RNA sequence: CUCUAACUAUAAAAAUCUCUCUUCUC
RNA sequence: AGCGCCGUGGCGCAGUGGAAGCGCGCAGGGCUCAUAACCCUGAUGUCCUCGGAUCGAAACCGAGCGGCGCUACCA
C-alpha cells in the first residue's frame, strides 16, 4: 500500500468526464423491455463508440425481465449489435442457469440424465440446448431411493433429443424463446417422457449460440419497436 | 425501475487478498478496482475482514461519486484447481457494501468449477507443511 | 543548536522515507527520534519491526544507529508520527540512504557558520534554504557549481558574506586513461615528447614503454572526456605520419 | 603463501588445484559429518565440517592433493 | 471525526481467547435499538452496562 | 491386527478407485476413504441477512445458498476436527451423531 | 396413533540422554 | 625507484567527516533435569605518526612512516 519494486520494462485523468451513458432496450419479446444503462468513453471519430459497443453482452436474471419471481434461477445473454443513440438495441444471444439452482436439484440418491444437442433453428441460427432431468420418487416409495436403468436414460435421452429438435428447427429464435418464457416445452418433455420413469423436474439449460447468418438489419427493427 | 443505476460489485474472495472489483452491466468498464491489500499495511491481513470492509468503502464512496445505487453481487472464490471455497473477506467485504448506502439485487454465486480438468499442483502425498 | 529540520517544512509528508535514530524502548515498539526530518518521534510497532519472526529484538534495532524506514502516517496537528520499517523497496534502501548522507552533509555544512558567528542556526538556514534544496535537486550539486563558478549563494541574500565565506574556506574528478605506443620507427620518442609538450599546455605520467596513464583532473565529468578523446587524437596524428603507429582502449 | 590452518571446525586455505564439490563429497562420507563450503568475501575459503576430527582432517588433506604436511600447523583450540 | 457509539450488553457470551481474559458480549446500541451486534470486550463486563465503540462495523469473532 | 472389519475403506468389491485431491492438503486418496462433506451454507450469515435486506430492492429475496462437497484427505479431516477418534466400542456405530441440530 | 431444515473460522521452531534389575512358602 | 590499497580489539570488515564502529571470537550469566542450540552482558585499542580547515575529529586533504600490485631493474 506504499510503493513497490517498480520494474519498468503523473499526467492523470479523470475517468468519467471523457465517459457518458447509454441505455439497453430489450427484444419485444421479453417484458419489461427496458433493461438499465451502460458505460461508453465519449464519443470520438476514428475509434467511434459504436464500433467498441456493438458485441458487448448484458448479462440479466430472467425475473428482471419478466417481472415475476417464478424466473429468478435463470438468467438471460443479450447481445449488442445496432446502436441507435442514448438507447441501443439487443437481439438475443444466450439462456442459462443459475448456478444455483442446478447444484440444488441434483442430490443424491436420484441420478441426473443430461441430454446435449446441436440444432440449426428455423431460419439460420445453430443452436446448442442442454436438458437436465432428475428421477422422481413416486409417491408411495418405501424403497429409499430412485435410480434409473441406463436403458431408461437411452430412451429419455434419446426423446429428448428428437424433441428438442423439433422444437428448434421448427421456429425461430423469437419463437424460441417465446416456448422458452413459459417453459412449455419443459412440461411436454415431463409428458413425453412421463411412460419411461416418473423424471422429476426437467428444465432446458444453457441455451447457447453458435453461428448467426449474416446481420438482418430487418430482423432486429422487427424485434424492437 | 425506479430511475436506477445498477452495477455489479462480483467480489473475487480468495484466502488471500480479497478482491473488490465493480464494473458495469457490460462487464468491460471497470469501476473502483480498489482491492483489500490497498487498505492494510501488513501484506498479510490482506483476507481479513478489515480490508475488504474499508476496500468496499472506498468502492461505495466511488460508486455515490460515480452514479451507481444499486448492485448485482456475483461472490466469486479462486475456485477452479483451489480448493473451490470462499475465502473469508469477501463476505465482510459484501456486508461492508451492504451497509453503505447502496442497495443490492441478484447476488451470484458465480465460482469457476472445473469437470476434473487439470491434474493440479501438489504432488501425490500433496501438502506436507 | 542542531534543529531546523533539512526539507522545506518541519513536518513529514505521507508515505515518505527516511532513516531514523533509536533511543529507547519501553514495551510495544520503540518512538525514538528522526535525523531525516524535524525531530520530532515517530513510532515503530513491533508488527512492523523485522522481516524475520521476532525472537530477538535489541539485535535488529540496535539502539542508537541509524536505519532505513518509511513513515507511514503524519499527525501535523500537535506532532505524531506513525513510521514503518519493513515495506521498503531493495532499490528504495539505496535512495534512502544517500538522501540521509545528502542531508548529513547539509546539517555538516550550515552547522559551521552557526558556530563561528554565535547567531541562529535556525534563522541562517531559513535564509539559505529557499534557493539550496528547491531549486531543482539537492544542495550539493549546487555547492560543487558555486566553488567552481559561484551562482548559488548569490541567488538570495545571506545575512552576511564572512559566514559564506568561512563556508568557502571549508570546503578549500580524476579520470584514467591508456595510451599503448606500437611503434617500428626509428625517431618515436621526439612525436611523443612534443604531443604531451602541446597536450599538457591536464595530467599526463608515465607507466610502462609503451603505456602512457593521463589521469585528468577534470571538474565536469565530460570536459575531461572530452579532453581526453581530444589528447588521444592528437597522439594519433602526430605518431601515425612520422612512421610509427599507436592505438587506445 | 598457500598457508593452510584449521580451527574449531573450518579450514582457511585450501589449493584451488581440484574442484570443490568433490571435495565435499569425499569429505561428508570419510568424516561422517555436516559439511558446508562457506565462500566470504576475501577470506581464506571457508570448508567447514563438526566434530574434533583434526586427525581425520589430517588423514583426508593427504588423501586428496597432500604431499607437503609441513606447513599445516593446525591451531589447537 | 467523532463516530463514537454506546451499546448496552443484553447477554454475555462467556468469555474467550487464549489469555481467558476477553469477553464475547451481544451488545443492542443505544441508538437504533433495534440492532444488535456481537463484540470482543477485554474487562470485567456485566449484563445492563453501557459500553463504547469507536467503531461499529467490525463483527467480533472468536479470538485464536 | 483387524482394526476395522471394512479395511476403513468402504470399497469391498470394486479392486480400484478413482483418486481424489484433498481440498486442503492436496493428497489423492481413493474417493470412499476420501471423507465427504456436504458443506451447504447460506451465502451470508445472519448477522448480515438483515444488513442485506433492508438494502435490497425486491422485498423478501430468496437469499441464493451455496453448496459444496468437500472430499478432505483423513490427515487434514482428523486435524482440522471434522473426524475425531472414537472409542473402540464406538467405531461400528455409523449413524451420523445424533442429529447435529435438534 | 400424522412429521423431512440451518451452517462456520488455526497447522512457526523443538536435537540429544549413564551405571543398575533382582527375592514367596505356611 | 614511482603511482594505487592495507593502517586494529586475537581476527575480517565498518563508517570515515557527533567521539568508541559490526560479526567472529573469549569469560560469565540466562534456558533445560543436563548438554548442544537459543537468549543477555563484557575487556580488548594509540583505525601508524605530522599538521591544516575544523565549536566538534580516526574520518576531508596534504608530507613522512611499515607491508602489498604493476612498471620491470626502467643506461
Ligand atoms: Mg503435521
Ligand atoms: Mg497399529
Ligand atoms: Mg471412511
Ligand atoms: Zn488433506
Same mark, same amino acid.
Given at each position: ?26 427484444? @419485444? ?11 461508453? +468513453?465519449? @464519443? ?5 463508440? @459504436?464500433?467498441?459497443? #456493438? ?31 442514448? +438507447? ?48 422422481? #420418487?413416486?409417491? +408411495? ?19 429428448? @433429443? ?16 417465446? #416456448? ?46 | 425501475?425506479?430511475?436506477?443505476? &445498477? ?7 480468495? &484466502?488471500?487478498?480479497? &478482491? ?110 | ?42 513510532? %515503530? ?202 592505438? %587506445?582502449? | ?77 | ?33 433495534? *440492532? ?21 462495523? *467490525?463483527?467480533?469473532?472468536?479470538? *485464536? | ?102
Amino acid at each position: 500500500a506504499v510503493g513497490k519494486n517498480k520494474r519498468l520494462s503523473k499526467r492523470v485523468v479523470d475517468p468519467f468526464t471523457r465517459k457518458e451513458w447509454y441505455d439497453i432496450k430489450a427484444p @419485444s419479446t421479453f417484458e419489461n423491455r427496458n433493461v438499465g444503462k451502460t458505460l461508453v +468513453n465519449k @464519443s470520438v471519430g476514428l475509434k467511434n463508440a @459504436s464500433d467498441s459497443l #456493438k458485441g458487448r453482452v448484458v448479462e440479466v436474471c430472467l425475473a428482471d425481465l419478466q417481472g415475476s419471481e417464478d424466473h429468478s434461477f435463470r438468467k438471460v445473454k443479450l447481445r449488442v449489435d445496432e446502436v441507435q443513440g442514448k +438507447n441501443l438495441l439487443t437481439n438475443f444471444h444466450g439462456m442459462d442457469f443459475t448456478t444455483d439452482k442446478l447444484r440444488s436439484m441434483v442430490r443424491k440418491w436420484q441420478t441426473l440424465i443430461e441430454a446435449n444437442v446441436t440444432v440449426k433453428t428455423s431460419d439460420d441460427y445453430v443452436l446448442r440446448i442442454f436438458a437436465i432431468a432428475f428421477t422422481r #420418487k413416486q409417491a +408411495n416409495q418405501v424403497k429409499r431411493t430412485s435410480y434409473a436403468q441406463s436403458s431408461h436414460i437411452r430412451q429419455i435421452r434419446k426423446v429428448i @433429443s428428437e424433441i428438442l429438435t423439433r422444437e428448434v428447427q421448427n421456429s425461430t429464435l423469437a419463437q424460441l424463446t417465446s #416456448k422458452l418464457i413459459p417453459e412449455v416445452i419443459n412440461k411436454e418433455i415431463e409428458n413425453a417422457t412421463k411412460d419411461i420413469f416418473p423424471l422429476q423436474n426437467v428444465h432446458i439449460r444453457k441455451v447457447k449460440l453458435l453461428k448467426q447468418p449474416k446481420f438482418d438489419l430487418g430482423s432486429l427493427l422487427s424485434l424492437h419497436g | 425501475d425506479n430511475s436506477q443505476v &445498477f452495477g455489479v460489485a462480483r467480489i473475487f474472495a480468495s &484466502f488471500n487478498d480479497t &478482491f473488490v472489483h465493480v464494473t458495469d452491466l457490460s462487464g468491460r468498464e471497470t469501476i473502483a478496482r480498489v482491492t483489500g491489500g490497498m487498505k492494510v499495511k501488513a501484506d498479510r491481513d490482506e483476507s481479513s475482514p478489515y480490508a475488504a470492509m474499508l476496500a468496499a468503502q472506498d468502492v461505495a464512496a466511488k460508486c455515490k461519486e460515480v452514479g451507481i445505487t444499486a448492485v448485482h453481487i456475483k461472490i466469486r472464490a479462486t475456485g477452479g484447481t483451489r480448493s473451490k471455497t470462499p475465502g473469508p473477506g469477501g463476505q465482510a467485504a459484501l456486508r461492508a457494501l451492504a451497509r453503505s448506502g447502496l442497495r443490492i439485487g441478484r447476488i451470484e454465486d458465480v465460482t469457476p468449477v472445473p469437470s476434473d480438468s487439470t491434474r493440479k499442483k501438489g504432488g501425490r502425498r500433496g501438502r506436507r507443511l | 543548536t542542531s534543529h531546523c529540520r533539512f526539507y522545506e517544512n518541519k513536518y513529514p509528508e505521507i508515505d515518505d522515507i527516511v532513516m531514523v535514530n533509536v533511543q529507547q524502548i519501553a514495551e510495544m515498539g520503540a518512538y525514538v527520534k528522526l535525523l531525516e526530518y524535524d525531530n520530532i518521534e515517530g513510532m %515503530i510497532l513491533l508488527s512492523e519491526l523485522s522481516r524475520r519472526r521476532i525472537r530477538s529484538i535489541q539485535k535488529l534495532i540496535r539502539v542508537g544507529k541509524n536505519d532505513v524506514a518509511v513513515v507511514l502516517r503524519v499527525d501535523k496537528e500537535k506532532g505524531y508520527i506513525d513510521l514503518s520499517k519493513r515495506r521498503v523497496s531493495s532499490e528504495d534502501i539505496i535512495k534512502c540512504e544517500e538522501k540521509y548522507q545528502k542531508s548529513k552533509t547539509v546539517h555538516s555544512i550550515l552547522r559551521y557558520c552557526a558556530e563561528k558567528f554565535q547567531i541562529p542556526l535556525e534563522e541562517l538556514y531559513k535564509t539559505i534554504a529557499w534557493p539550496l534544496s528547491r531549486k531543482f535537486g539537492h544542495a550539493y550539486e549546487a555547492f560543487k557549481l558555486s566553488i567552481i563558478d559561484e551562482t548559488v549563494w548569490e541567488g538570495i541574500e545571506p545575512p552576511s558574506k564572512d559566514v559564506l565565506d568561512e563556508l568557502k574556506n571549508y570546503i578549500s574528478v580524476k579520470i584514467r586513461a591508456d595510451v599503448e605506443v606500437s611503434c617500428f620507427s626509428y625517431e618515436g620518442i621526439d612525436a611523443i615528447k612534443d604531443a604531451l609538450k602541446s597536450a599538457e599546455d591536464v595530467k599526463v605520467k608515465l607507466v610502462a614503454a609503451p603505456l602512457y596513464v593521463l589521469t585528468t583532473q577534470a571538474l565536469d565529468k565530460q570536459k575531461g572526456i572530452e579532453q581526453l578523446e581530444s589528447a588521444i587524437e592528437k597522439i594519433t596524428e602526430v605518431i601515425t605520419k612520422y612512421g610509427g603507429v599507436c592505438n %587506445i582502449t | 603463501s598457500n598457508y593452510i590452518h584449521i580451527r574449531i571446525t573450518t579450514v582457511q586455505g585450501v589449493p584451488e588445484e581440484y574442484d570443490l564439490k568433490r571435495i565435499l563429497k569425499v569429505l561428508k562420507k570419510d568424516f561422517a559429518c555436516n559439511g558446508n563450503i562457506v565462500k566470504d568475501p576475501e577470506m581464506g575459503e571457508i570448508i567447514q565440517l563438526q566434530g574434533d576430527q583434526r586427525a581425520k582432517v589430517c588423514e583426508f588433506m593427504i588423501s586428496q592433493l597432500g604431499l607437503q604436511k609441513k606447513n599445516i600447523k593446525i591451531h589447537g583450540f | 471525526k467523532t463516530p463514537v457509539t454506546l451499546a448496552k450488553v443484553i447477554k454475555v457470551l462467556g468469555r474467550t481467547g487464549s489469555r481467558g481474559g476477553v469477553t464475547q458480549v451481544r451488545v443492542e446500541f443505544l441508538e437504533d435499538t433495534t *440492532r444488535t451486534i456481537v463484540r470482543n470486550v477485554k474487562g470485567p463486563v456485566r449484563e445492563g452496562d453501557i459500553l463504547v465503540l469507536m467503531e461499529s462495523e *467490525r463483527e467480533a469473532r472468536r479470538l *485464536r | 491386527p483387524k482394526k476395522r472389519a471394512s479395511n476403513g475403506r468402504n470399497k469391498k468389491g470394486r479392486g480400484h478407485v478413482k483418486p481424489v485431491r484433498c481440498v486442503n492438503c492436496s493428497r489423492s486418496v481413493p474417493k470412499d476413504k476420501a471423507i465427504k462433506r456436504m458443506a451447504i451454507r447460506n451465502i451470508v450469515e445472519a448477522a448480515a441477512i438483515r444488513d442485506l435486506s433492508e438494502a435490497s430492492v425486491y422485498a423478501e429475496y430468496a437469499l441464493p445458498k451455496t453448496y459444496n462437497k468437500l472430499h478432505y484427505c483423513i490427515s487434514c479431516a482428523i486435524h482440522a476436527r471434522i473426524v475425531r477418534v472414537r472409542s473402540r466400542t464406538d467405531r461400528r456405530i455409523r449413524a451420523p451423531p445424533q442429529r447435529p441440530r435438534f
